[PDB]
Design a protein around this ligand. Structure first.
Ligand SMILES: N[C@H](CCC(=O)N[C@@H](CSC[C@H](O)CCc1ccccc1)C(=O)/N=C\C(=O)O)C(=O)O
Ligand SMILES: N[C@H](CCC(=O)N[C@@H](CSC[C@H](O)CCc1ccccc1)C(=O)/N=C\C(=O)O)C(=O)O
Ligand SMILES: N[C@H](CCC(=O)N[C@@H](CSC[C@H](O)CCc1ccccc1)C(=O)/N=C\C(=O)O)C(=O)O
Ligand code: NI
Lengths: 147, 147, 147
């Protein structure tokens, strides 16, 4: 008996996220050509540094997204976690698109991505609490008994 | 019944990757000493910034590698995924070695690493498709029936 | 039968790590306000670049921590891995706090975090070795037999 069925949506969202990250990377390389910035060195016109920074930030947050997605999806509910992941990834795509154009336009999609990530965190926290809190509470009651 | 046996190669490749990352970090610190760059601050002679950038880029890609490795290894085939992972990690080591010497010498091993990563992605995609596409197709046919 | 029970501590430590990372990010944003640095652009007074760099470095190491934690926890022992993870995360929090104040004060907690990470690596290595080495040794003996 395989557990592929229990995690296939998490794996699919994860893969979509990877693909999206690849997209961000290629867009940064395209900004390296457009605005004549050769490796190493990550300075140039404002628009390049903005595109670059959007990609860097997405990259920095991508493992946080994965960790919470998987923990939430396993401990709370797979579908909810996957949905939140989709909302997050769409929000991040919009973030990247915004940032590339103007610092201010990254902001609205940025906020959407953060809410989804905290929602993933809260589900993770609730799921873990549901797992640990009953056994812990019971053990404390047993000692209290005793009398 | 443990599932260690089904994922031991993925875990081994993962650990090798971690070790390799540790190696990149220590090489960067060594460049910080050689070329007199004290923390914080990541600017100095060209050779330091190149070594530094090789490490940074490897670090940025390392979670993408892990995600696709695991998804491909679970959904498609463990051995193939591990092999691709080994090729990728070797390619990245060569990338780092190249970059440290000259921007242009990172390029050949860079290309090898990218092909292996996309190969991992394609296996992940195929594996997930194999999981989801039949059930989805059947459900669509059932509605078509109906008549 | 679920395997949540076998990985719940790893998941909890992982989530704590995510929360800690969120904390580092918010502290960096607070340094962006205090020392008047607007996005993109990551240069300003020394204290901002130090806080920023502490966060960046923690972020760079966070997936390495996760990978080894999970591999060690599954292949060697869950509790040991979780404990090492807790020590690591506390060490990193202290690292961030130190760095924010002075480059030199990040150093003591930095060393604590590295020992814990290498301890995780060693457990991962030992666990994987325990899994692979017997079967490999037996296979070699069988060929030796033969005679
Ligand atoms: N800081 C920017 C970041 C952009 C980037 O990292 N682009 C990739 C290359 S993009 C080629 C393909 O998109 C490969 C990425 C990929 C991602 C997920 C799955 C498969 C492939 C890259 O240059 N990697 C290493 C290096 O800088 O030498 C830069 O300097 O290039
Ligand atoms: N940007 C470069 C990056 C190199 C780096 O990150 N080196 C490590 C230290 S290298 C020591 C050992 O190699 C620990 C790393 C390790 C990795 C995987 C498993 C076990 C240990 C480090 O300095 N970490 C935090 C900090 O900058 O304060 C730098 O400024 O140091
Ligand atoms: N280089 C620093 C890094 C700090 C940082 O990344 N802060 C977060 C925002 S902090 C808001 C919440 O803390 C969300 C983070 C979070 C982490 C884990 C779980 C849930 C939420 C951020 O700015 N992200 C994207 C962007 O720069 O546009 C900077 O320029 O902001
Ligand atoms: Ni099972």
């Amino acid at each position: 008996h395989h557990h592929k069925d229990e995690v296939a949506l998490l794996a699919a969202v994860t893969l979509l996220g990877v693909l999206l990250q690849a997209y961000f990377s290629l867009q940064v390389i395209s900004a390296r050509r457009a605005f004549r910035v050769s490796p190493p060195l990550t300075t140039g016109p404002p628009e390049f540094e903005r595109v670059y920074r959007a990609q860097v930030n997405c990259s920095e947050y991508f493992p946080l997204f994965l960790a919470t997605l998987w923990v939430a999806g396993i401990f709370f509910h797979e579908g909810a976690a996957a949905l939140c992941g989709l909302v997050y990834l769409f929000a991040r795509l919009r973030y990247f698109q915004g940032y590339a154009r103007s610092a201010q336009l990254r902001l609205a999609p940025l906020y959407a991505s953060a809410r989804a990530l905290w929602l993933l965190v809260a589900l993770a926290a609730l799921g873990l609490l549901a797992h640990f809190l009953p056994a812990a509470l019971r053990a404390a009651l047993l000692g209290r008994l005793r009398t």
